[PDB]
Write a protein that binds this ligand. Structure first.
Ligand SMILES: Cc1cc2nc3c(=O)[nH]c(=O)nc-3n(C[C@H](O)[C@H](O)[C@H](O)COP(=O)(O)OP(=O)(O)OC[C@H]3O[C@@H](n4cnc5c(N)ncnc54)[C@H](O)[C@@H]3O)c2cc1C
Ligand SMILES: Cc1cc2nc3c(=O)[nH]c(=O)nc-3n(C[C@H](O)[C@H](O)[C@H](O)COP(=O)(O)OP(=O)(O)OC[C@H]3O[C@@H](n4cnc5c(N)ncnc54)[C@H](O)[C@@H]3O)c2cc1C
Ligand code: SF4
Ligand code: SF4
Ligand code: SF4
Ligand code: SF4
Ligand code: SF4
Ligand code: SF4
Ligand code: SF4
Ligand code: SF4
Ligand code: SF4
Ligand code: FES
Lengths: 137, 664, 446
């Protein structure tokens, strides 16, 4: 039974609030994703995601605020640019670009957070362990 | 080696202990790299919990503390205060959310897995806390002055509110008088009170207040700085006439311009009056109207011929200086309020209404001036074509509004329905037997006592044709106006004959308002008005700190809504002045100038314009205005060189969390 | 001439009251925030989204709510009422009724003498209560226990108990053991405070549309009002945000919106005024149904669509673009089919000039707004007069929209007349400034 290793970097104001609301509503989801809780998900550098993938992450999830709903008014657009370029980079280096995703969860969507956890867990179990672990890292 | 961290795990009374093994979590934390003590307690948000935290801090000499409990947004201030009481910096505390994210979502049949997730969360929290520094709270002092740009009702209200709060305030008015648009109105909907009558006490209060410097006939030349200290350079336009204070300062004991008016009586130059929409004559030396706050009689220098007759008209008082130029004043303010107001949309476009080519077609402000008793005539509405009183007046509502054709405006001007009703009432009252026709397309009486006003207007005899005017022709013999539209109710085409046609034109920001709002770093909205900090919960604020918006410059409004907005802006501006300090965000960005390369990419990356490129030790580096930064982290996450330090969320601390996730 | 106490009182913890209290506290004045309900949020806490930006209401309000609770200059007395007010602008002796909360806060538990904190908000008590009552926050559509909270995102999360419905079985006491937060035998407390100024922010309620029998609001099961629709469409409402028919629980494909329901009426049953925001939340509801339920169509039976504010007309343009049908005609009457409880709406489409009979699976009435119950009694307690429309009267209709004729009392929010949220917040800040003026000067002359 191989245990997937998904890392999440979720902003304080919307995604973290959404996860808190999901917990408050007693919405169940598998215990596979652990969070980081940056302030604005525009704090997320590309080197964070790449370091996670190198260190042995099986999947990476970054959750922010809906466009036009950022607490700092522009962070999620910078994050979106960075994550689009990250998807390019993971495809072009031979990694599966579907191992990484960025979601937009607001503070009122706990059920959406549970659905996202289920979907990410299912996708990563389908893809299997990261190839980077086998090749000498 | 030096960091010693204490881990404390809360049971939350079988809320956490019912889903995971707390003993396993504690015994695991006892073996983490930097851990001096690991303890468990039932309710650590209670006073015994704080007592235990303090006792452990004192007896193990902990460098930092990690609490495995509910979400930080619930009890982070609580445990920060707990840690501060005990001899540790508040921001040396770290929290692991093991209830909202581990115990309440993994209840059923997930016991070993939930414990493993708790171990991972505690590991990541300890890894972050081992690299946490001391964040001493710091603040920026605030200059105890305020600036209000715009002397209208919004600017006047904001200035009076700030002054009566005990704050010295500058009121900067472009025109020689403050009153604004309200001074041009004859009556006010829906109460029909005289506008000058309700506004004159406010104007004299502004003029008399010791805490307000009323600088009229001047504008803002440039602005620099931030919320703590705005250095604003103003140009005092050459007024040409001295006030008694300025006359005494100049040297002569003779007073300056008691307002007698002899100069205007002898001036031989005639020019249009902007206050009367250009329908009335005025001299080169003049006042807008009799009820001007500073009764000081400006001279129009680009129209004066320097004949020097007004100086003999003003002898022994020497109030007139024909040969002085604009001065520049550098003022040091704390906050600023923008109240620039509005102007009329140019309805000379939209050719099917003959505003400029037909003589008996006028706009609403011209109508107000023509029907006011202080206007070019004795309040007698007369036709511009021949001066005869009209018996039939049409009102074209929505003139240039809700228009998506690119000529007019796509928004509603908010008050054109109400003052059109007021104008219809005024014509039907002042001229007996006159009939008002209102060509309307969605009558909008939304405010308090507005629907009752609409009912009363209909009851007094006003005709409402529900149809946007298609076009307007004029008869060559009698300059009467044929108005062609459809009565969509009754479903028939209609050609209405009117002696006078009044266009309820849309409103737009005043000329030069966009340059001013760029000068203060305020962004425009997609309608072209000044943008708000938050459209819902901060109607007065702006993204730039220390700048607040009041009045129609934020968007078209009624006088009561404008006054409410102005008072709110005054309160928001007074708050930092009253406190005397602006507390910086606990987690601002710092530039490590030893690593900056002066590329300047990050400058355009901050929504709040905090980042700028400046010299330091002869090198071009980045400078962070801490008063503007908000700890978003966008710049720190971008800079390739790692020259920006997001404290409490630094790159070393976040990577430390990621490293510990993939550890044992 | 007379000194002013450096304290202020804000009655009503709605968005207006919250903003007034926050502004006064930021100015440095100690402020009392008096709330009738156990939580402060107000009507804005019941909305799902907000016109015209379609932002989520709780997400914007949660930071402001968290600040009021933490703020050291604000004492937030929830579940309390004003018994009596005496005095004048100098000193206002106001006596307050702390209703029997039934559950102690940790501060109160410490004051009592027991080290056990009170009500960390675990919610174990509500899990064992055998009484099931309607929830006023959802206002009769969701079940709640005798001990309860209005919703999850309540500012003071202390789990009040309704003693009029509690049977005193004592099961929640065992559910909360070792914290001793629950005291079933406590009663009302009478406190006296001295304040310099007072701000009234009592808000509004819905006009009773059980009248206007031609729209079978309480007759037909699939006829609801605006706030019921907001609670049904919110993801935190009685259902999972899925708009369903109350008659059978099926998803409606077709809903009508009756604008001006009880509004602009001179018949003496409804209100002669405009409620100033019915059109906009009707448009918002049309957008929400069209987005959430695929293929559902909104019909708005309107009369003078009123989108007057900033970005309001563009919202109207967007709603029409998304496919909302606009029939310009006031609804004449409503019938229902006995077999399938569909609603026949009979009116005229005055444009196109023809009678119209529209089937709808659901019907939503944009009811007029009214002053809350007990607002007239409080308004008389402070010596404030009323308007001709029944709202609280301002000092001057133009140049003093927040102050009253009585000194030291100021108005904020819908209690002065229907307004949008930004207008309400602007009024609240203005009232806070007007109240801060005498306190900052520390002296007034009468
Ligand atoms: C025809 C008409 C009739 C109306 N009737 C009514 C009515 O009956 N009742 C009612 O309540 N409302 C009425 N209104 C609306 C009312 O005029 C506005 O609500 C109100 O005037 C807005 O106040 P304000 O001070 O923001 O605008 P303004 O008076 O336009 O404020 C702008 C002021 O700032 C000055 N200024 C502008 N730019 C600068 C600059 N760059 N530097 C320095 N100073 C500057 C201007 O000279 C002016 O003094 C009417 C409007 C119109 C057009
Ligand atoms: C269906 C609907 C949809 C809406 N949608 C929107 C929208 O999308 N966007 C928008 O901007 N606006 C919207 N609005 C308008 C918005 O709800 C109001 O502008 C806003 O609620 C006004 O805030 P308030 O604090 O004045 O009112 P309230 O929230 O009602 O404030 C009153 C508060 O004071 C308390 N209180 C009352 N009387 C007393 C008393 N005697 N003692 C103690 N406490 C008391 C009440 O319990 C309540 O907490 C909507 C309104 C409705 C009805
Ligand atoms: S700190 Fe959090 S988890 Fe611990 S007892 Fe208090 S509320 Fe419960
Ligand atoms: S003549 Fe002199 S005193 Fe008289 S109005 Fe003119 S400037 Fe003023
Ligand atoms: S000098 Fe100028 S202002 Fe004076 S009277 Fe001659 S034209 Fe008029
Ligand atoms: S206020 Fe009335 S006349 Fe003016 S744009 Fe709006 S609907 Fe048209
Ligand atoms: S901080 Fe970084 S991005 Fe900004 S100017 Fe310096 S080197 Fe360039
Ligand atoms: S953290 Fe955000 S606001 Fe602060 S300097 Fe960086 S980009 Fe600007
Ligand atoms: S059971 Fe006790 S601790 Fe839990 S919410 Fe109820 S009163 Fe508070
Ligand atoms: S004592 Fe009252 S609140 Fe407690 S469980 Fe029994 S009925 Fe419910
Ligand atoms: S806001 Fe719209 S729906 Fe409400 S009363 Fe006014 S016109 Fe009717
Ligand atoms: S605060 Fe969450 S995206 Fe910026």
């Amino acid at each position: 039974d191989w245990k997937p290793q998904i890392l999440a970097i979720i902003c304080n104001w919307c995604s973290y609030a959404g996860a808190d609301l999901a917990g408050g509503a007693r919405i169940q989801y598998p215990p596979t994703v652990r969070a980081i809780r940056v302030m604005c998900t525009g704090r997320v550098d590309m080197l964070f995601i790449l370091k996670a993938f190198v260190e042995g992450a099986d999947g990476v999830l970054v959750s922010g605020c809906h466009f036009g709903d950022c607490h700092y008014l522009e962070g999620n657009y910078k994050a979106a640019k960075r994550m689009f370029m990250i998807k390019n980079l993971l495809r072009n280096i031979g990694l599966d670009d579907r191992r990484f995703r960025m979601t937009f969860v607001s503070a009122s969507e706990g059920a959406k957070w549970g659905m996202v956890m289920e979907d990410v867990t299912n996708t990563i179990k389908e893809l299997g362990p990261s190839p980077i672990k086998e090749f000498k890292k | 080696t030096e960091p010693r961290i204490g881990v404390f795990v809360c049971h939350c009374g079988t809320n956490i202990a019912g889903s995971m093994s707390i003993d396993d979590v504690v015994n695991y934390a006892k073996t983490l790299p930097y851990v001096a003590v690991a303890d468990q307690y039932q309710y650590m948000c209670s006073t015994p919990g704080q007592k235990k935290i303090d006792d452990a801090i004192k007896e193990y000499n902990l460098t930092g503390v990690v609490v495995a409990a509910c979400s930080p947004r619930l009890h982070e201030p609580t445990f920060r205060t707990a840690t501060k009481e005990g001899g540790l910096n508040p921001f040396r505390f770290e929290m692991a959310n093991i209830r909202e994210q581990n115990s309440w979502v993994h209840m059923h049949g997930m016991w070993d897995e939930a414990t493993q997730k708790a171990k991972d969360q505690v590991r990541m929290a300890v890894a972050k806390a081992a690299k946490l520094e001391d964040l001493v709270p710091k603040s920026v002092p605030v200059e105890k002055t305020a600036m209000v740009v715009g002397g209208g009702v919004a600017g006047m209200q904001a200035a009076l509110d700030l002054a009566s709060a005990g704050i010295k305030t500058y009121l900067i008015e472009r025109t020689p008088t403050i009153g604004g648009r309200m001074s041009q109105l004859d009556k006010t909907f829906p109460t029909l009170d005289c506008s000058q009558c309700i506004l004159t006490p406010k104007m004299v209060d502004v003029g008399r207040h010791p805490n307000i410097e009323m600088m009229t006939y001047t504008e803002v030349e440039k602005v620099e700085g931030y919320i703590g200290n705005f250095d604003v350079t103003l140009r005092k336009k050459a007024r040409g006439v001295l006030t008694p204070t300025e006359a005494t300062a100049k040297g002569i004991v003779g007073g300056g311009c008691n307002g007698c008016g002899d100069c205007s009586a002898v001036c031989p130059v005639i020019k249009p009056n902007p206050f009367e929409m250009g329908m009335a004559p005025r001299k080169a030396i003049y006042i807008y109207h009799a009820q001007v706050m500073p009764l000081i009689y400006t001279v129009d220098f680009d129209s004066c011929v320097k004949c020097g007759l007004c100086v003999e008209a003003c002898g022994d008082k020497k109030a007139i200086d024909l040969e002085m130029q604009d001065e520049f004043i550098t003022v040091k303010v704390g906050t600023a309020v923008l109240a620039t107001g509005y102007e009329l949309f140019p309805i000379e476009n939209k050719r099917e209404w003959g505003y400029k080519q037909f003589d008996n077609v006028i706009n609403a402000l011209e109508f107000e001036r023509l029907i006011c008793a202080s206007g070019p005539t004795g309040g007698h509405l007369v036709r511009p074509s021949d001066g005869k009183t009209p018996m039939k007046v049409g009102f074209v509502l929505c003139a240039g509004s809700r228009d998506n054709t690119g000529i007019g405006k796509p928004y509603c001007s908010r008050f054109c329905c109400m003052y059109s009703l007021k104008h219809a009432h005024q014509i039907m009252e002042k001229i007996p037997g006159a009939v008002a026709y209102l060509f309307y397309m969605d009558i909008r009486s939304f405010g308090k006592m507005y629907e009752e006003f609409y009912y009363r207007i209909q009851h007094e005899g006003a005709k409402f044709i529900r149809g946007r005017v298609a076009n307007v022709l004029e008869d060559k013999e009698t300059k009467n106006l044929h108005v062609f539209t459809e009565d969509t109710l009754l479903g028939r085409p209609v050609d209405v004959e009117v002696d006078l046609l009044v266009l309820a034109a849309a409103v737009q920001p005043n000329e030069g308002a966009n340059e001013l709002r760029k000068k203060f770093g305020v962004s425009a909205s997609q309608d072209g008005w000044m943008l708000e900090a938050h459209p819902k919960l901060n109607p007065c604020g702006t993204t730039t700190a220390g700048v607040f918006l009041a009045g129609v410059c934020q968007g078209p409004k009624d006088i009561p809504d404008t006054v409410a907005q102005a008072e709110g802006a005054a309160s928001a501006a007074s708050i930092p002045i009253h406190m005397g300090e602006v507390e910086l965000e606990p987690y601002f960005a710092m530039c490590i100038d030893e690593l900056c390369a002066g590329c300047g990419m990050c400058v355009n990356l901050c929504p709040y314009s905090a980042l700028s490129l400046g010299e330091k030790n002869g090198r071009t580096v980045m400078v962070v205005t801490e008063a503007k930064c908000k700890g978003c982290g966008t710049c720190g996450g971008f800079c390739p060189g790692g020259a920006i330090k997001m404290q409490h969320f630094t790159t070393p601390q976040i990577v430390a969390q990621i490293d510990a996730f993939f550890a044992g």
